[PDB]
Amino acid sequence: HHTDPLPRLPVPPLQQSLDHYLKALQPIVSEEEWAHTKQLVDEFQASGGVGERLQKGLERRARKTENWLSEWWLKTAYLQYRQPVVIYSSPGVMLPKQDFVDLQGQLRFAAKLIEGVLDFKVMIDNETLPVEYLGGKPLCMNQYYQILSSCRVPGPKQDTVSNFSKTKKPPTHITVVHNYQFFELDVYHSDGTPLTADQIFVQLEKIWNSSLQTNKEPVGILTSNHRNSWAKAYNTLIKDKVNRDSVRSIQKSIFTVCLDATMPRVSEDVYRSHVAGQMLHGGGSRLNSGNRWFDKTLQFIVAEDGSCGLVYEHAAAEGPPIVTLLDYVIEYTKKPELVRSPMVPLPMPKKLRFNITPEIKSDIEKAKQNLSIMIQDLDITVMVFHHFGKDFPKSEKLSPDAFIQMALQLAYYRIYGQACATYESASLRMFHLGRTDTIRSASMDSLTFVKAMDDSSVTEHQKVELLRKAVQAHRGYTDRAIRGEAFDRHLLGLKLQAIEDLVSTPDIFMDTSYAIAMHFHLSTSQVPAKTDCVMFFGPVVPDGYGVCYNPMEAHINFSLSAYNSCAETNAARLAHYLEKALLDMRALLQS
Template identity: 45%
Template structure:
């Protein structure tokens, strides 16, 4: 049994569906008939449900609304709060619309294994029409390598591919340990879905296709695609030496750069959906696209990345894995619809980019730790060859005028996306989770309150704050939002910035803020947060043809759901970290990996907004963490 050190350490779910209410990202959640939304996607039907986990609960309406008011209060004046309170009272009246929508959810929960899962897959992902890069797909940066030769890089690549396949065989044979949250087993289906799944673009809604029995990967180099068979004539995995020969062959066949077909996958889903329809009109193109979609995963062999001024290597790696530096660097050597694409740069920048629809970050992180250890131990070295007579198959694409125009549009757009992301990847080495635990505090809650403090010291206003909590103790569970901005977190920030307060006052405020966050975290992991229930009530209104209730346009909801700080803990044992883009134009994203003696952070903002800066937020975060360490250390010393 694997007991996750931090059961809520999954990647950020972004709260796309929630944020749609205040029209930050898009004007409409989706526009479907009730009949259309009642069809369970084939992807969900394919899941393994043998664990017999409990169903996701529907919280009591009053419980959710009371909690919502507490989370909205920091963002409202006294007059506004009174108005929001009155509106909530009206909504929750036993004869009001809230009661009707709540009844609908309760009935839905009785007839489905998870009342939210289908809605969530659609509203948070498959209906989302922004580009997946930056806005949805995270990057996981692995420890940076030092490839002295091209051969060394290809050896690393071969070992990575075989390590992934070894883990997949463990998954397929149900030999991986079950993740646990305390005594509760967690849903393991996401492990089965990260390898072999692909997102397929649509004109209004995308879909997912799952190929668990596929036996090939696709390797990209200089924008060329190659299908590589991984199993020999006797259905055994090929050896490291045999795979290495395939990779050398690919490099020899792809010296010249091909048209960047893959860059189309980086564009908005509407643009890509239209281009895809044009692309597959050509039978050869359709066949090549299908082989990419059916592959287990992608391996992108990239050229070096050009650094920006004063940029550390971790930050260069973050840009490389998030967007490839745009069309002028490695941005075309991708197929962003594939759930996992491993990226192996000539300059030693390695890791992965993953399409978020099928899975949270923790299964991806667990697989990554397995890969890293396997490569380090050279576990595949020396294994004998198997009967095998395959060669890499080039997957050709024919580019007509329409596709060329789409490539030019996508290239312009990906460059704007890449140039518009302000990224800073921080290795914080003053202390790690060992110190925090020595103070009998939750490392995750400590870091979350540090992020709150950092935002307040920069902006002097409360920042609505998203952290994802795993709800995998339930069948098909995904996430719930931890609303980290609280009355207690703002009180702590104000106390820290008040020179008249003693260290004891500051420590008291810190512990209250951490306790409040920890309490909300436990409730969220058990399915009793605010945001998923409110989303369900809104979607119920849409399915029933009801007017969207007024609470969703009230300042209390709009401001508390405008997540200016979007965060997640994704824990890896290796020296890695995840990064992604902000949820809102005037916000920050921050993913972190707390290790015993240090913490890795991936911090981002958008360059277009004058109020945000990744470097300024990084500086404030470093100062906040050190301030919190110092008041604890000083208070502890004074008691000795």
């Protein structure tokens, strides 16, 4: 007894996408590049040309697959991408800081966290998750079955994702890591009932007392390295039988819990952003970065000072399902405990040891060095925008997300004097196995709006009109992307279809304009959550920013990242300008 299957991801018409492409280039390429590109696009879609053939191939593909894009996207965005997953790929989440002030409180909370994960897991194992809906239509729930009991596995050419969640006898253990030492924690009794919060606590105390030592090699930091380096250190590491079993238990574990040491000083105004770094990368090879296995799809982190969150491996996951999980887990942690499984003898959780050799020690040192370089190059800021949230744009009958996106467009322009390639993530969950597509926030509408906004010679009435029209156009683009009518994945599909067809890369993809279009100086996503949390990730280009936010009713949590390698970007500076742009838009509309 079930409802019908979801629609399949559509292949958009070629002309509809190339026109949208040409529309989207206008604000970010020169007059001369635009005209060249239009000629290129004309040769491309020409009757009897390269583009028509590639489009028939996609149409073919969609007929033969459940989702024409899914393998391609997994592979090109993640598994064949060989930069470290840390910062460049795995997004982190920072929770409100918890109350606890002593180890009991810390391990109690971790205990409840684990209980909540296992409760959510019931619906996962059973496939009884309440289906999520959008606009009265159901959304694909497939991503929720790719989060637990899974792990990325390094490979020589590309990586893979192992999922043990539906094996004949699925894992019943989690892994816990503390002072770089990993432990296998069984979280179900022989009868298949979960341990209780109290039983989890007792076991965590054993794990804590078994890992007090701080001079153990941080093997886990190897997972933070370039994927080709890590693929090599990985094979070295698991030559040893014990080492292999330890990795194995980590990879198979339902999820990982990191019991973090507290960070250094921090200015007291640089804190929120230091904790964000802690969640994203660990803070450094001397800090918690080796208290981690970055291949693990789900890592929860509980620090000594109350600082909490997670970091997730992105390859098969997206933000919203991860924060649904998180929202559930946190709200579980505040529910009354009801039924206390009877006292029983509890075994000693197994410490998962590593035999280190001079070689493994050398990989570790090299990994510490690489990570230090990455962390040192990362500029991240967290801004809480307190003046308003969804409430204000809602009162103006404007989409709050489109409003925020236009504010960011305005900020960028006030700093840089021009528009830039901007990505906003769109969820394609209305379709079977759908992941994401690209909303392009820089448009002639936004450009006209931002150029006019500070022009003393334009009337306020004119400015308001252009504002409402930029915001509303962005909402239109947003809704089209979510219905499968955007073009970026379609263009990527055309390119990959070319490789399939044994032809060279089409000229439109080697053009001037396409690199500029694909070079996102602003890489963004809205990730709404019931919990007052924020998500963050690194920029996708050396000279760009990563922007992620959680709009609540009366405030908005923002994170912004940049690389220090590029003196012209400054996360905190963009954050200030973004605060001012939101303020200036509300003021303009209310005058």
